[PDB]
């Protein structure tokens, strides 16, 4: 029941604040300020020296990212599950907003300054100009904004974009493509629109964000059709790469290395 800490702080004798006087506090704080300033200066110098040894165009190591992953767009709110209603425009508004923002560079208006490249041939560019092939949005028919502002939504046929992760200097072998099949036995119709997946080789290799300015990665658009009266919800569709032995898709630890699985739910 004794307040010994009352005299510990603001001690009337000698003016000891927590056992140290005003001068002692000032000296110790000045020492710690100078010490931490010197430490920060040394840390910053060492960081600058390290960054001066790095390449601004290609990362030093690429052995931790040897094969591309497979990802869907847009990213749903939770757990990569697409949930919306046909009748309520505000249920799927975010998906359409994201798709319009993503597909703006792919419209012919923006990519009119790009170059046309022959199909089916790997496009290696040793030169310093590093031109970028153009990906016309017409390949994603019925899943582009040109034909209909609602990307299949408001009709019961949502459109979802599937893209392969960009890797610098990766040259796929064979004929890369992405196939998507419904996991359920009900097998609602899924339509990969550029024929098959058909990841054409002229978009590879990726040369980096710095060098290969204006790059547009190939896109695959999947459309999941539903009946008018029958919702056909809780449909699960899995996509994977099955054209290149260079691009692995059977990894057990990584469920997204070369493949992607997502669920679509439709209402009304």
């Amino acid at each position: 029941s004794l307040a010994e800490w009352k005299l510990f702080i603001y001690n009337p004798t000698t003016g000891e604040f927590l056992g140290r006087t005003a001068k002692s506090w000032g000296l110790i704080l000045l020492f710690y300020l100078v010490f931490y300033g010197f430490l920060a200066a040394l840390f910053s110098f060492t960081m600058w020296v390290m960054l001066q040894t790095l390449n601004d165009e290609v990362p030093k190591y690429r052995d931790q990212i040897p094969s591309p992953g497979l990802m869907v767009f847009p990213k749903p709110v939770t757990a990569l599950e697409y949930t919306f209603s046909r009748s309520d425009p505000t249920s799927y508004a975010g998906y359409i907003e994201d798709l319009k923002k993503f597909l703006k560079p792919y419209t012919l208006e923006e990519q009119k300054n790009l170059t046309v490249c022959p199909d089916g041939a790997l496009f290696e560019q040793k030169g310093p100009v590093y031109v970028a092939c153009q990906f016309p949005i017409s390949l994603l028919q019925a899943c582009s904004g040109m034909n209909d502002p609602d990307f299949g939504y408001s009709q019961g046929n949502p459109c979802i974009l599937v893209k392969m992760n960009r890797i610098i200097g990766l040259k796929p072998e064979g004929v890369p493509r992405i196939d998507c099949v419904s996991k359920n036995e009900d097998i609602p119709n899924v339509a990969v629109y550029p024929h098959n997946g058909m990841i054409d080789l002229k978009y590879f290799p990726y040369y980096g964000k710095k060098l290969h300015v204006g790059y547009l990665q190939p896109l695959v658009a999947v459309q999941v059709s539903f009946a008018p009266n029958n919702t056909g919800k809780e449909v699960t569709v899995e996509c994977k790469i099955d054209g290149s032995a260079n691009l692995k898709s059977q990894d057990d630890r990584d469920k997204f290395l070369g493949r992607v699985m997502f669920k679509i739910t439709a209402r009304a």
Binding site: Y61, D63, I65, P66, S67, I167, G169, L170
Partner: protein, 34 residues
């Protein structure tokens, strides 16, 4: 011919385990010296 996306992880493991064994044996030798 160098290839990106590949690193000799197995040789790295051999050399690291060899260095660890050499260090442990040196520590044992220094500890029990006489």
């Amino acid at each position: 011919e160098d290839d990106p996306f590949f690193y000799d992880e197995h040789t790295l493991r051999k050399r690291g385990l060899l260095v660890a064994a050499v260090l442990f044996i040196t520590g044992i030798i220094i500890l029990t010296s006489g």
